[PDB]
């Protein structure tokens, strides 16, 4: 039975939880303390020390798209993430690094920010939701027929979609609804109607960050 | 940006290029497209090295009825994505029936850019034919006045709606076409029979530089014209005086004209000294504005009978042919306006889409394979298949085409045709009799004013608990609450049956709303019909809407010229 | 016939040039003047404008750890820079991932920046090395028993070393020798022995950068 070294809050950790989940698989989950990081989290990654880290076969993965692919490719029998051709991982890649980096750092100017930064950050996102909007062209999900790798990706941030709509005093919907309503269609799936917690836990919890630091 | 030369240099190449934009039109559509939950039934993943053959060969030709559930899982609550992709930011509605049952299709802001590219091309082309000056103006009798936001908090929407109160329109048609006469307000006016009261005497506010009268049907010009002839008495009183008439009710576009108005008493004596002289008005367009290069509408199809009063009413001036596409579909444009009405082809602009042809060739109808848009042969009639952003992928929208001719390497259609006809049982009645027997109960307590009603549709909407339907009602003028309240009341008191009994007399189902329609809206139905992309067999309007019907849908909520619950009851 | 968008000091268009060579592909190399971005440049990314750009099929592939593992997905038949374990490939995309993050940051600050910034950024290349030193531990290469994904992410920055030895004034072999040694030994591939320019016209653009922002 595989272990997952993860955070409640953390979107990529939700990655994973999403991609476990998704396919077919028993999974424990394991809640780290980055004041008091576990054993297992110091011998597995005492690098970065970071999450989600999957063990399995006595062996770790560490990262979020890491874990994914990982999973992907290790049972590649049920529902695949990514399309048949190279060009169709392709773009499932060059989306995935788009919404693991410029996205991610726009949203984290948006949650974790004030002044100048969120407001930046506010247009950062925007111009992004719509550039990834019009990439998608119109596609009920995003790496192939059904669930995707970038579908896993950025299904994540429709956690994290409330809390935006709130701190950066947006409305991703009204501007942009097709992606938080893409978001409701990847809702009605139990993989990230149990992998990722309650709306309200985070933008709450995001405050509180920013309760705790100026 | 919006030139001659270059463009039309431009579509020339294109409709040269039509097997390979065709092509990369369908590589465009899955490329955007690989994630659709009917193309895993379908067994897609994009690329491959037989991918148009994959496609012809793999995924099935689908119904309206087939193409309801989906979309409808897009727009109520569930605003989930499926079909195309994207729920949609607005919805659209389709001719004829499923199963007399409403059709719901998706319009993407690729729509709108199909819109705004072949509006660029066609009006260069007739700009090409029919030049017109750039600090002029033309009579556009065009609306979108509703806005409806569907059961799940998503808008749902009509091509006109669509494009007019789009957030590019405005930027994106500047260049394009001579500026609007009518205030965008009076335009999108919660009051459109009395609104474009004002569309006649906008577009008649600046005569001299209408380049050209507007509405894209024959007949959408022959009623604008025997509404046109609705008004002339009053409306010289109404700018005379520096007051307009007590026709008017909407704080909006009554703060607009009063905005315009001021009182000159000499021009009363110019209008009727002109207007008469006339044998009753052969040349009336030019008449109204000597100076329009044209009459510009869709001259064939449906409007065959209204060409002749519309010429009847445009005399001598010239009556130019529209190009075809829809909220759908989009399909050919007219680069050679200057041929009449009856010999009219229209040419297909290859990235609008990826459309194949089932021949009709055999005896009724024939077993035969859909051929490619250059394999269909000239002089057959074919039956249009569409593959476009408007979540349409090899479905059947059933009307007949014929192909005349070729415009270089991409062939001319021709439509001879009038309904996409075969309906079946539906659920949205209360027998189509028994609605249409409501109407004309109802209606009479509004012929006592002198009128008779034009068109009429209706809506079920669960949204409220109970659940209540609401009846739509195109009349040509403006009157009291009260006669239309009773007039609810009466289309309560016409469905006849023992069903409809046992509910609101229960109140299972709530009391009908009565939104009674300004005059237009459901000439902008079949003006939205026509026009689509296929056949001119799209004039079979709906009259009773069931979650999934859409264009008059969005033609549905802000117009409102009086909304009211039934006071009995 | 596979078109390269690439520029002469990209340590990233050298991953992608080391990439096509190591498996066996004939390919032509457009130099970029990022003062004009090309047309078919700007039509393969018309936001980041960034290179390197394999073109194949007409269909551009972006960013360089993308390009690499399209390399491999393009012909999957004689050299793979993977092993066949989704464990090792993990493995593998993990410390890719680490080439990318504080390693290129750090050498962009030791040849990039001066003073307060500069320490800080030859201790944490110090640092890099040395966790990369441990991570090489025995490997004649890196992400499998032969040339590897991530050899082809980390060789190309050997070029590099000289600038960061100069400017730094320092000598990043003597507290982590194996690693530059592993870089001259990884040279011996045709794949980066004919892609990589010059290490003093490399050390000559950091003068340039450095001539012109101080
Ligand atoms: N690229 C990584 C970023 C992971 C990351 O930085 N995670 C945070 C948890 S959300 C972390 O490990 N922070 C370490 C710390 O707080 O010191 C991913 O996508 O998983
Ligand atoms: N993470 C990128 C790094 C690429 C990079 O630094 N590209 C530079 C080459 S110096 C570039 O293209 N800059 C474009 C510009 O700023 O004009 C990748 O590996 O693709
Ligand atoms: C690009 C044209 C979009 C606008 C469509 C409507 C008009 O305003 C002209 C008729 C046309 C209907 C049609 O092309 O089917
Ligand atoms: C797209 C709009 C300008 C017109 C469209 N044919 C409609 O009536 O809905
Ligand atoms: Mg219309």
Chains 1, 3 share one sequence.
Not at chain 1, 28 to 37: A, G, L, V
Not at chain 2, 318 to 327: K, Q, R, T
Not at chain 2, 517 to 522: C, E, H, I, L, N
Request: charged share 25%; net charge negative; with cysteine.
């Amino acid at each position: 039975l595989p272990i997952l070294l993860d955070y409640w809050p953390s979107m990529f950790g939700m990655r994973a939880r999403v991609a476990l989940r998704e396919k077919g698989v028993e999974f424990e989950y394991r809640e780290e303390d980055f004041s008091n990081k576990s054993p297992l989290l110091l011998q597995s990654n005492p690098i970065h020390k970071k999450i989600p880290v999957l063990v399995h076969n006595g062996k770790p993965v560490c990262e979020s798209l890491n874990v994914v692919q990982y999973v992907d490719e290790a049972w590649p029998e049920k529902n695949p993430f990514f399309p048949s051709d190279p060009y169709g991982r392709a773009q499932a890649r060059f989306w995935a690094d788009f919404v693991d980096k410029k996205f991610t750092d726009a949203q984290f100017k948006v949650w974790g920010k004030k002044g100048e930064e969120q407001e930046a950050g506010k247009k950062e996102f925007i111009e992004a939701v719509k550039i990834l909007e019009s990439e998608l062209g119109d596609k009920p999900y995003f790496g192939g027929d059904s669930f995707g790798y970038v579908d896993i990706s950025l299904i994540t941030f429709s956690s994290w979609f409330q809390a935006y709509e709130k701190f950066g005093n947006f409305s991703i919907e009204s501007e942009s609804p097709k992606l938080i309503a893409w978001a409701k269609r990847c809702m009605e799936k139990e993989s990230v109607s149990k992998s990722l917690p309650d709306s309200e836990k985070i933008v709450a919890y995001a405050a509180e960050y920013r309760k705790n630091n100026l | 940006t919006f030139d001659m030369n270059r463009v039309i240099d431009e579509f020339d190449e294109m409709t040269r290029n039509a097997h390979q934009v065709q092509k990369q039109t369908l590589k465009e559509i899955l490329l955007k497209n690989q994630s659709a939950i009917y193309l895993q039934n379908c067994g897609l993943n994009g690329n491959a090295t037989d991918p148009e053959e994959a496609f012809k060969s793999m995924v099935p030709l689908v119904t309206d009825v087939e193409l309801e559930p989906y979309i409808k899982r897009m727009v109520d609550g569930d605003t989930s994505p499926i079909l195309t992709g994207h729920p949609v930011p607005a919805i659209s509605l389709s001719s004829g029936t499923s199963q007399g049952r409403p059709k719901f299709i998706p319009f993407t802001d690729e729509l709108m850019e199909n819109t705004l590219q072949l509006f660029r091309t066609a009006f260069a082309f007739r700009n090409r034919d029919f030049p017109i000056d750039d600090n002029g103006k033309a009579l556009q009798f065009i609306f979108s006045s509703k806005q409806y936001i569907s059961t799940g908090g998503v808008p749902v929407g009509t091509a006109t709606t669509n494009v007019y109160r789009n957030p590019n329109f405005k930027a994106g048609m500047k260049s394009i076409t001579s500026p609007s006469c009518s205030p965008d307000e009076v335009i999108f006016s919660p009051d459109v029979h009395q609104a474009l009261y004002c569309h006649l005497l906008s577009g008649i506010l600046f005569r001299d530089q209408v380049q050209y009268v507007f509405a894209v049907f024959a007949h959408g010009l022959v009623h604008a014209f025997r509404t046109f002839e609705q008004v002339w008495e009053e409306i010289v009183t109404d700018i005379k005086d520096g007051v307009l008439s007590n026709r008017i009710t909407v704080p909006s576009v009554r703060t607009a004209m009063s905005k315009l108005l001021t009182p000159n008493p000499e021009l009363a004596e110019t209008i009727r000294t002109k207007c008469m002289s006339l044998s009753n008005w052969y040349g009336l367009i030019p008449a109204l504005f000597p100076n329009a290069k044209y009459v510009y509408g869709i001259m064939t199809g449906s409007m065959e009978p209204y060409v002749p009063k519309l010429r009847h009413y445009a005399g001598d001036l010239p009556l130019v042919s529209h190009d075809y596409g829809s909220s759908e579909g989009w399909i050919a444009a007219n680069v050679t306006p200057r041929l009449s009405p009856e010999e009219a082809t229209f040419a297909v602009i290859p990235n609008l889409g990826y459309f194949e042809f089932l021949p009709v060739s055999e005896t009724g109808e024939g077993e035969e394979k859909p051929v490619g848009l250059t394999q269909v042969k000239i002089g057959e009639e074919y039956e249009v298949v569409i593959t476009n952003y408007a979540g349409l992928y090899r479905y059947r929208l059933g009307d007949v085409v014929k192909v005349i001719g070729f415009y270089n390497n991409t062939p001319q259609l021709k439509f001879i045709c009038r309904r996409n006809l075969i309906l079946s049982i539906n659920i949205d009645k209360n027998t189509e009799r028994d609605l249409q027997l409501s109407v004309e109960s109802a209606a009479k307590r509004l012929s006592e004013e002198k009128i008779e009603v034009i068109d009429f549709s209706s809506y079920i909407d669960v949204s409220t608990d109970p659940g209540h339907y609401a009846i739509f009602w195109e009349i040509s003028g403006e009157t009291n609450e009260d006669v239309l309240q009773d007039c609810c009341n009466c289309l309560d008191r016409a469905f006849i049956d023992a069903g409809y009994v046992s509910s609101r007399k229960c109140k299972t189902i709530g009391a009908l709303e009565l939104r009674v329609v300004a005059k237009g809206t459901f000439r902008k139905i079949q003006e939205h019909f026509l026009g689509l992309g296929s056949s001119a067999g799209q004039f079979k309007m709906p009259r009773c809407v069931k979650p999934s019907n859409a264009k008059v849908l969005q033609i549905l909520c802000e117009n409102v010229v009086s909304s009211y619950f039934s006071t009995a009851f």
